[PDB]
């Protein structure tokens, strides 16, 4: 049980993941955060009004903000990396470091252990001392974030690098010690304490998919201690943080979230997390920091959040006064002073709209287009700084109205994030989104995302009947890489190095694995399903046009689809009777006579009735799926069945799974 | 932790008690001082069964509370023993349960205690003359 | 000249207000115990107002209803950490100001809340607005402005309490 | 029994059909004391299921 | 707030089928109700009614004022009944035959007695606390909701009827005085201002009106379901109160439609009412679910991010001073093509390209939009979208032409407004009548409701586009009454069939009935001497029963379906009779309407069906 | 009859005293009436009932 | 002379502390016991002792 009352200070800007600090300072802290434009700043909220210090000039987007020191000393210097280089201030307006760490592309994360400095990139990481490269490494996989494990309570420097494919490796100089192994894609990772726990050393991630963990990285191996894997709390970790808000004694987890939650979860079983309180946003937070910011001698959380909001969850009440008829005067002040602003900002902009109208914007979309796992169904997230106004669907939580006419939604009132979902069938590879704010011009901005013609995964069992194909002749490895990602969904565009490459995927609507192998000139591409091997060799049929069977595999793949359709069938067969029971249950009170039988559904009513308004979609998507692999089976002997289908679904219709076998392997 | 009383460690002392009644007269959990908390921290108690009934005093630092054990006279509590002029019951060496555990404490609960475990009690026949326990 | 008279809630200790509430010449670091009959000047929202102390224990909150009817000006006071003996202090106005002498003088009357600081609290008011009480209008005041020790909110109801005089 | 018409499943006691003691007056049921004057629309109490009507 | 008080009642509350009354005179009571046909009373312990029939309409009011009880109404698609809980017994149990789709309960214009007022195919009516018929008249379509609202200030209070032909009528005693075209079925009306009333739709649109225009209006998912006006903050003006399909109950303002306060619940919202439960003198909010929870209620910083979105358009504006000539002009055609739809042609007098068009009209397209997709190697300057409206309303389309170049990420998008005219179609028997002057006027109404002896002749054998014609016309010219001379021989000889027809369909259900009753008392028989056999263990004569038990439920099954097919047809021809009384008023404009309609009652009740002609040929 | 079948006494009870309204001296309505009050089990007004279909008749076997 | 908060449980386990001038609450808890005890130490009006179906050891302090 806790309470924070939400405080709002300063609007700045949009901003990046984690772009927000606090300076050390018993009394208030002060506030630093960077702007997508350069403009980084800090303020200290002496009393309501931001008193703000050193407000640089505008630049490059600013894409990391860190705060650190050289030897003991309470760390102050606070670096930035704005387009390929890194700029460092003091606890004021003094720039004295601009390393220029000349690159190509940019800066996606940093970390500053005194004079050493981990810098990542798009794929490259380096660690430099005093602008003198001494490590290089070069993923095959984007980098999410860099941490070292503290030099001063340790020996060696140990850092660890965040691939986008689920992995941490924990390298030193320039090669991977090992590789640990996480659910998700890590997005955030700090040492769960202002010195890196307790016992020796231990690091905490959280993941893309909304997970947390402490992974403890021995010298050789490491030791998970617990994981937050959640089920109704999706959202990707943008931020984490430690410090002790509850004032228990021992610090607490300040965890963020890209759905606005912000989280604190407490360690009362001594060993383990427990949640105390959550609250949304209606925006994506970027950062997250404890101590106080505003009124000292009490504890708040500061909270960045993505258009720039910079908001406090505080400790202490908000009805410091309460006399007569009443309605507290602070809500007067601010009421005037966005009064007054208002009225001159209008006299402005009018008459500037008068002069560009008898005279006659781009702006940022944090998508993320991610797969959710317990579905088949991707969810589309769209932000933007304003409030939308509309957003096209073109192809080939959420409060908006659909757009159906190509799916147009209008987002009501003065909301920033939408979330769509998206479902694609195994086949069908090619979609738009045009997204409008509400800003004067009322410009559009189009983006295009990608349905592939399966999650990747890091292993699989070779003990399943593989449908192996192989692809032979006159390739350039990368323009066969260049294929494989136009066909697989989370495969690294930069064609990794080796000329020989494996990946690992899986099926997500049912677990088989699609096992793939190639070389410079040479693939092989393992299977469980016969579906998939089929639209593999379609699709790279049609790229190249461009520029075998285990006998018991389609019995493998009946037997996984069997209970799916049972589950369906007998959901349809209940809720058929459910109403009908229901009308029997208001009289006589069901004390002797209901058959034990419908007693069994006439409590779970209510779920077997919601779950049947999702049913038919999942019934018409395995017939769909039964009959691609019937079609496909036959397809690869060198038949053209495409006319048995209908007894086919009169089969599935009746549904005897021996007779449905039956008519696979004869006709 | 299953109680059947209750009881008040301190009538004027900073801290507690309680009292274990879980199956076949066990008095073992009986939950203790650093009243502030009173927590896990439960003073040994070596009673035979359960204390039915609780009780506490002024003279003495409480230590008049009873153990009113089932079949048995209370008991006055000092700590890891008794305190009984004539009729209230005998110490806290479990008089019906050493029995059972006293020769034929053999193994856990299950019959590969005494039903399949007849090595440690076919040579041990101590509780003399079963009719307590 | 102008006394003024807290109670508080039973089982408490919360009455450790009046040294913080009275000046920097003579500051207490002690916990100061709401024993009453205290006699100091203290320089308050108004002007150098005087004061009157007390003991609420259920089986002690009787000497507080022995100097009830009288008083210059007047206090209000309650315990926002109080999750069941708060119950009780519903009652103590009504033993308080329903007392024909306290009724008799329009001077100040408001009951105000406490320990902010705490991680328990409620509405500002407390005492005549939070807990159903808001009917205590014919009373010639309101209370407002409490932390827990830290010093604040003492010219909070001001206005209606201190600077009403 | 196996017709139900009456819109009030409990009404008020006092207006629906659904003196001396039986220490005097002799009785058929529970109540119902005997009366004068039998009619063939006489239904003096009804029953409670058809298991007791039957029985 | 806080909710004043709370309870959970293990019945399924139908949405609409909720009120308050106090039925022991002074002590209120709540009505809702329930799956299976019964209707619960929930005194402060449940109580159930055995309405043994699927419930449509429920109210409760004051039907006869010399008592203080509240009488609780229940309709159903063929029944009406008024029920007085305390001392059950029926007031008034009338069989309708048009249905109860909605009712209401309390005073008209001029009629010193509270009407219980219904709604049913396409004829309202009205009953007094013994269930004499008081008031009838006729609609459009289908009934949906019904209201008691002082339109036009005078003190006593028309009636707002909410047709499934997407309109707003309002009903006086006799006269109708207004019709306002909403853009889905109506199902909520409330009033509680002097002439302001609340309205909702089937899209899920919440609004509020004037006398004959729109203060606010909002759009969402999650259509609601119970609309009532309350004082929440009172502040002395009551606001809105709604109760969503998923839970949410948002007091919004009668003021542009600002919501004030806000609550949740676990499943939809059936009703919300007034009513002052726990006896306090005054009223309170009660919010009553679908799955039975009912909770009672006794009566920042956006701005900020305005001033950013200004600073932002001054930032473009000085960035200024994917990218587009500036003199960039939309300009719009309408047109009709045969050979189907009304054509609107979108081009730019540039070099310019309509990436796409997002058209956004209310009641014209299925779901509010059109987009029109072209594909990259189909762009062109002009871009073509068909329209085809489903009735003749004028209807305003605000066009959103994504103007950009061929290869863009990002491009402008030009608003505009283009109504489509009432007789947006109809590319360039019969009713007569005269019109007042100017034949150039007449010219002018042609050319401003078309896309293109004072005696008007119109030659078309559909009834309600003649009817549509001569309304709008009498609306153009300024013409407050009309008598017309029109033939439909076609139309009426089916609607003479349609009543020949009648009668016969109701032997056929009468016979039926009684056949049915007779098997019914068979099987009740049966049940007992079944039951009879297995109390004294003679299994040979039990299963004898069953089998007979089994046999009469065959026929009577196969009797059920022929007198569900007799009965749907029935009701089919009974609203193509009021459809056809109201087409022949609808023909009318002003007091020349009303005759016609009690004439054609007045013709149906004598079965003089040539004179009933006569009155719907010349009136 | 029939309104004693939907179990409505204070119903018929009415049309009862409607019906002697119109007829002003009936003795079957009289002793309709005075057969509900005892069906209802208050024979303080069925004797009333009775007794006013005596005055009516003075021969009725079942009064 | 004296009684400060004089508790008491209830059938459906209601915690009903009651003030010696007023009631204190009436809430929807687990089950109660057959004694109980104000074993404060720090001051406490509460008991926090606790007893339920499930063996929990409460210490919650709300002619």
Redesign the interface.
Same mark, same amino acid.
């Given at each position: 049980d806790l309470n924070l009352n939400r405080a709002d200070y300063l609007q700045v800007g949009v901003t990046s993941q984690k772009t927000m600090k606090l300076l050390p300072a018993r009394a208030t802290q002060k506030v630093v955060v960077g702007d997508h434009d350069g403009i980084v700043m800090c303020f200290g909220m002496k009393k309501g009004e931001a008193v703000t210090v050193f407000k640089t000039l505008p630049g490059q987007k600013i894409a990391r903000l860190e705060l650190g020191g050289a030897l003991n000393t309470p760390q102050e210097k606070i670096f930035i990396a704005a387009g390929s280089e890194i700029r460092g201030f003091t606890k004021r307006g003094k720039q004295f470091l601009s390393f220029e760490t000349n690159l190509t592309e940019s800066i996606k994360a940093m970390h500053i252990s005194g004079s050493d400095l981990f810098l990542s990139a798009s794929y490259i990481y380096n660690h430099y001392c005093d602008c003198k490269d001494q490590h290089y490494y070069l993923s095959g996989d984007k980098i999410n974030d860099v941490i070292c494990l503290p030099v001063e309570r340790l020996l060696r420097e140990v850092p660890v690098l965040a691939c986008q494919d689920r992995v941490l490796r924990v390298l030193q100089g320039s090669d991977v010690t090992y590789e640990i192994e996480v659910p998700g894609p890590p997005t955030v990772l700090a040492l769960h304490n202002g010195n890196g726990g307790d016992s020796g050393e231990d690091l905490l991630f959280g993941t893309s998919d909304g997970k947390l963990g402490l992974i403890q990285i021995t010298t050789s191996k490491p030791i998970h201690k617990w994981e937050i894997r959640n089920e109704k709390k999706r959202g990707g970790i943008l931020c984490v943080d430690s410090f002790d808000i509850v004032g228990d004694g021992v610090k607490d987890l300040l965890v963020g979230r890209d759905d606005g939650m912000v989280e604190v979860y407490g360690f009362d079983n001594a060993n383990e997390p427990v949640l105390r309180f959550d609250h949304t946003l209606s925006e994506s937070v970027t950062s997250i920091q404890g101590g106080c910011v505003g009124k000292d001698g009490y504890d708040e959380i500061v909270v960045s959040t993505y258009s720039g909001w910079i908001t406090g969850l505080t400790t202490e009440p908000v009805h410091k006064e309460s006399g007569p008829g009443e309605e507290n005067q602070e809500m007067q002040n601010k009421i005037s002073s966005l009064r007054s602003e208002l009225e001159q900002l209008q006299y402005k902009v009018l008459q500037e709209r008068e002069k560009y109208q008898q005279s006659s914007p781009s702006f940022s979309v944090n998508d993320k287009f991610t797969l959710n796992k317990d579905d088949a169904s991707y969810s589309l997230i769209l932000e933007v700084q304003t409030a939308i106004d509309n957003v096209l669907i073109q192809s080939d939580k959420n409060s908006a109205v659909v757009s159906f006419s190509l799916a147009t939604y209008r987002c009501q009132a003065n909301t920033t994030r939408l979330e769509l979902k998206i479902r694609s069938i195994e086949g069908q590879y090619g979609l738009q989104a045009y997204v409008t704010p509400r800003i004067q011009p009322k410009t559009c901005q189009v983006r295009q995302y990608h349905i592939k013609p399966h999650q990747r995964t890091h292993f699989i069992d070779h003990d399943r009947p593989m449908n192996t194909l192989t692809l032979t002749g006159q390739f350039s490895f990368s323009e066969l890489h260049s294929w494989v990602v136009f066909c697989m969904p989370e495969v690294p565009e930069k064609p990794p190095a080796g000329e020989c490459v494996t990946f690992y995927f899986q099926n997500t609507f049912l677990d088989t694995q699609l096992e793939s192998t190639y070389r410079k000139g040479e693939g092989v591409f393992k299977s469980d399903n016969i579906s998939t091997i089929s639209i593999l060799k379609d699709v790279l049929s049609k790229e190249a046009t461009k520029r075998e069977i285990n006998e018991v595999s389609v019995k493998h793949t009946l037997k996984l689809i069997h209970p799916k359709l049972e589950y369906q069938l007998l959901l349809a067969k209940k809720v058929q009777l459910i109403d009908a029971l229901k009308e029997l249950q208001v009289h006589e009170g069901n004390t002797n006579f209901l058959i034990p039988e419908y007693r069994c559904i006439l409590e779970e009513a209510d779920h077997l009735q919601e779950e049947y308004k999702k049913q038919p979609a999942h019934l018409e998507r395995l017939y769909g799926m039964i009959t691609d692999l019937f079609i496909d089976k036959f397809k690869f002997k060198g038949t053209n069945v495409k006319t048995k289908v209908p007894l086919l679904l009169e089969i599935l219709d009746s549904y005897d799974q021996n007779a449905l076998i039956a008519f696979f392997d004869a006709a | 932790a299953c109680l059947a009383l209750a009881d008040f460690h301190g009538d004027g002392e900073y801290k507690l008690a309680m009292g274990d009644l879980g199956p076949d007269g066990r008095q073992p959990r009986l939950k203790v001082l650093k009243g502030h908390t009173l927590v896990s921290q439960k003073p040994l108690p070596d009673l035979p069964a359960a204390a039915v009934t609780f009780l506490m005093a002024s003279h003495e630092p409480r230590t008049p509370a009873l153990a009113i054990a089932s079949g048995p006279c209370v008991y006055v509590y000092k700590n890891l023993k008794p305190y009984f002029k004539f009729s209230l019951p005998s110490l806290p060496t479990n008089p019906l349960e050493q029995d059972l555990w006293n020769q034929a404490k053999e193994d856990q609960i299950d019959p590969l205690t005494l039903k399949e475990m007849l090595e440690g009690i076919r040579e041990k026949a101590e509780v003399p003359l079963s009719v307590q326990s | 000249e102008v006394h003024v008279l807290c109670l508080g809630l039973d089982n408490s200790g919360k009455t450790t207000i009046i040294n913080k509430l009275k000046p920097s010449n003579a500051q207490s670091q002690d916990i100061v115990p709401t024993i009453g009959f205290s006699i100091q000047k203290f320089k308050s929202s108004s002007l150098s107002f005087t004061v009157f102390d007390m003991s609420g224990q259920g089986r002690y909150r009787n000497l507080w209803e022995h100097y009830y009817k009288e008083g210059q000006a007047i206090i209000f006071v309650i315990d926002s950490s109080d999750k069941l003996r708060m119950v009780v202090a519903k009652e103590e106005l009504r033993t308080l100001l329903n007392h024909p002498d306290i009724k008799h003088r329009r001077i100040p009357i408001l009951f105000f809340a406490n320990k902010m600081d705490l991680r328990d609290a409620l509405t500002s008011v407390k005492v005549s607005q939070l807990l159903c009480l808001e009917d205590i209008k014919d009373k010639p005041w309101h209370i407002c402005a409490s932390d827990a020790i830290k010093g604040e909110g003492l010219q909070e109801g001001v206005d209606w309490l201190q600077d009403q005089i | 029994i196996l017709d139900e018409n009456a819109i009030a499943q409990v009404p008020r006691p006092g207006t629906s059909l659904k003196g001396p003691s039986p220490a005097v007056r002799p009785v058929t049921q529970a109540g119902r004391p005997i009366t004068g004057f039998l009619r063939p629309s006489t239904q003096s109490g009804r029953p409670g299921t058809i298991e007791q009507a039957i029985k | 707030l806080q909710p004043v008080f709370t309870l959970k009642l293990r019945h399924k509350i139908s949405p609409r089928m909720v009120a308050v009354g106090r039925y022991d005179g002074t002590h209120p009571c709540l009505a809702a109700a329930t799956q299976a046909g019964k209707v619960f009373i929930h005194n402060p312990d449940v109580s159930l009614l055995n309405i043994n029939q699927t419930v449509s309409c429920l109210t409760a009011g004051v039907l006869n004022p010399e008592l203080g009880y509240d009488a609780l109404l229940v309709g159903t698609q063929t029944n009406l009944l008024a029920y007085d809980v305390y001392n059950n017994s029926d007031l008034f149990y009338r069989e309708v035959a048009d249905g109860a789709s909605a009712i209401v309960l309390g005073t008209l214009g001029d009629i010193t007695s509270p009407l219980a007022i219904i709604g049913g195919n396409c004829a309202l009516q009205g009953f007094n606390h013994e269930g004499n018929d008081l008031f009838w008249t006729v609609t459009g379509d289908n009934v949906h909701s019904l209201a008691l609202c002082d339109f036009d200030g005078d003190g006593k209070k028309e009636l707002l009827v909410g047709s499934e032909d997407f309109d707003i009528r309002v009903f006086k005693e006799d006269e109708i005085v207004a019709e306002m075209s909403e853009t889905e079925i109506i199902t909520s009306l409330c009033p509680m201002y002097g002439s302001r009333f609340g309205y909702a739709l089937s899209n899920g649109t919440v609004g509020v009106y004037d006398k004959t225009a729109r203060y606010w209006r909002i759009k969402s998912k999650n259509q609601a379901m119970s609309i009532h006006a309350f004082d929440l903050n009172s502040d002395g003006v009551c606001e809105l109160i709604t109760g969503w399909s998923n839970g949410k109950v948002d007091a919004r303002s009668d003021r542009t439609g600002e919501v004030i306060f806000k609550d949740n619940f676990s499943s939809a919202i059936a009703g919300v009412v007034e009513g002052d439960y726990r006896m306090e003198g005054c009223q309170q909010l009660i919010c009553c679910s679908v799955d039975g929870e009912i909770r009672g209620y006794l009566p920042i910083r956006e701005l900020s991010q305005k001033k950013q979105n200004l600073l932002l358009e001054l930032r473009n504006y000085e960035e200024n001073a994917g990218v587009i000539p500036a003199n960039t002009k939309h300009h719009t055609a309408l047109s009709v093509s045969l050979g189907a739809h009304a054509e609107l042609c979108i081009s730019t007098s540039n070099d310019t390209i309509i990436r796409a068009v997002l058209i956004f009209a209310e009641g014209v397209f299925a779901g509010e939009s059109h987009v029109v997709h072209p594909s990259v190697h189909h762009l062109s300057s002009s871009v073509r979208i068909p329209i085809t409206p489903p009735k003749d309303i004028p209807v305003d389309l605000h066009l959103k032409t994504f103007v950009g170049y061929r290869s863009s990420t990002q491009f402008h998008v030009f608003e505009l407004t283009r109504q489509l005219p009432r007789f947006s179609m109809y590319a360039l028997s019969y009713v007569n009548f005269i019109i007042a002057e100017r034949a150039q006027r007449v010219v002018m109404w042609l050319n401003q409701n078309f896309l293109l002896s004072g005696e008007i002749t119109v030659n078309t054998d559909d009834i309600d586009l003649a009817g549509d014609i001569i309304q709008s016309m009498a609306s153009f010219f300024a013409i407050e009454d009309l008598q017309v001379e029109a033939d439909f021989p076609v139309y009426f000889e089916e609607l003479r069939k349609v009543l020949v027809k009648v009668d016969e369909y109701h032997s056929v259900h009468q016979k039926l009935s009684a056949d049915m009753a007779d098997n019914s008392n068979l099987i009740r028989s049966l049940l007992v001497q079944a039951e009879d056999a297995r109390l004294m263990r003679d299994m040979k004569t039990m299963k004898n029963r069953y089998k007979e038990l089994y046999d009469l439920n065959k026929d009577l099954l196969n009797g059920y379906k022929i007198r569900c097919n007799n009965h749907t047809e029935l009701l089919g021809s009974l609203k193509a009779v009021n459809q056809a009384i109201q087409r022949a008023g609808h023909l009318r404009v002003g007091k020349p309407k009303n005759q016609v309609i009690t004439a054609c009652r007045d013709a149906i009740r004598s079965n003089n069906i040539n004179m009933l002609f006569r009155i719907m040929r010349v009136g | 009859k029939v309104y004693?079948?939907?179990?409505?006494?204070?119903?018929a009870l $009415?049309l009862f005293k409607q019906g002697l309204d119109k007829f002003p001296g009936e003795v079957t309505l009289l002793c309709g009436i005075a057969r509900?009050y005892?069906?209802? $089990?208050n024979?303080s007004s069925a004797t009333e009932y009775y007794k006013e279909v005596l005055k009516q008749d003075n021969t009725h076997?079942?009064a | 002379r004296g009684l400060q908060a004089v508790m008491a449980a209830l059938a459906n386990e209601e915690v009903r502390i009651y003030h010696d001038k007023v009631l204190l609450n009436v809430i929807r808890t687990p089950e109660a016991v057959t004694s109980l005890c104000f074993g404060r130490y720090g001051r406490e009006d509460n008991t926090l002792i606790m007893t339920t179906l499930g063996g929990g050891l409460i210490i919650k302090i709300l002619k």
């Open positions: - | - | - | - | - | 004693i079948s939907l179990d409505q006494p204070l119903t $009415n509900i005892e069906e209802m $089990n024979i076997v079942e | -």
